[PDB]
């Protein structure tokens, strides 16, 4: 019984963290094969012309280390908001990996790194405005986001910046910044964050399975009518519902009743659900199924 925001085990990724220093800048890199990926603002010295910074770059000014082992830098290139740094040593601990760009509502794992070493690991969920609800301080850029699927590490995030509100932004491993934000120390408009409704539905189904039912509405509202309401009450639209069939079948409660309970919950934070804020949206149906039933 129970539901917790978990991280997948980090061991396979911990071996791929390096320290990347250039001048007075220090942050983290991801060492796969003979390449080190890191955010390009490590080489920055108002608005930054990265192409110029890369043109005055001397390779011997890098310091890239794995613990106390220093890696020779062979080449640098630009990959969007990242540097691709070729190093002279192959990482023997490189897992089987892929790159994937995550979508709003999807869960992944953050391995928070400082000085080129993992310091913590936690689960996150990409928000509707392409930020994550994180915990990073200066020095954590380059902290990787990952998923583990059938022995393959899916790299989806390298930490980049914190918006003026304390929301966190990274790029995918192709160097495309999530949300389109710029890696510039400037005033940037941040999109409105909305609660991801399909994840709220998964959470409320987990609550039913865990015997929490005080919040359950008797009323019923249709998907398309709820969606009209959602975009005026800070919640995303519901687009996929076939994933809820198994939960509706285990519980007897269909989505339309949960949608109506969601409206009621928004008019109460007058009571907790499973110890959480009633409308938490950090859990996916996939996460709930693994924690409730092990599959």
């Amino acid at each position: 019984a129970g539901l917790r925001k978990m991280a997948q085990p980090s061991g396979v990724v911990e071996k791929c963290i390096v320290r990347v220093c250039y001048g007075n800048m220090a942050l983290n890199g991801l060492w796969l094969g003979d390449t080190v990926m890191c955010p390009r603002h490590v080489i920055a010295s108002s608005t930054i012309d990265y192409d110029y910074a890369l043109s005055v770059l001397r390779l011997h000014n890098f310091s890239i280390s794995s613990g106390n082992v220093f890696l020779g830098v062979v080449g640098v290139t630009m990959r969007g908001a990242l540097l691709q740094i070729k190093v002279n040593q192959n990482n023997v601990h490189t897992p089987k990996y892929t790159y994937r760009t995550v979508r709003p509502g999807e869960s992944f794992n953050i391995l928070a790194c400082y000085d080129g070493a993992a310091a913590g690991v936690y689960g996150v969920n990409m928000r509707s405005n392409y930020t994550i609800r994180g915990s990073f301080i200066n020095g954590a850029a380059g902290s990787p986001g990952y998923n583990i699927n059938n022995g393959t590490v899916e790299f989806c995030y390298l930490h980049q910046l914190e918006l003026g509100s304390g929301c966190h932004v990274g790029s995918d491993l192709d160097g495309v910044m999530y949300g389109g934000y710029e890696d510039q120390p400037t005033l940037q408009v941040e999109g409105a964050s909305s609660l991801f409704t399909e994840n709220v539905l998964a959470f409320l189904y987990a609550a039913l399975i865990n015997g929490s039912t005080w919040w359950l509405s008797s009323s019923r509202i249709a998907v398309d009518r709820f969606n009209e309401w959602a975009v005026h009450n800070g919640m995303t639209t519901v687009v996929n519902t076939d994933c809820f069939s198994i939960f509706a079948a285990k519980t007897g409660v269909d989505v339309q009743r949960l949608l109506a309970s969601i409206q009621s919950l928004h008019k109460n934070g007058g009571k907790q659900i499973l110890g959480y804020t009633s409308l938490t949206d950090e859990f996916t149906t996939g996460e709930v199924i693994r924690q409730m039933y092990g599959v």
């Binding site: 942050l27 301080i137 954590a140 120390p185």
Partner: peptide
């Protein structure tokens, strides 16, 4: 980390 005020 860069902060974008």
């Amino acid at each position: 980390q860069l902060k974008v005020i």
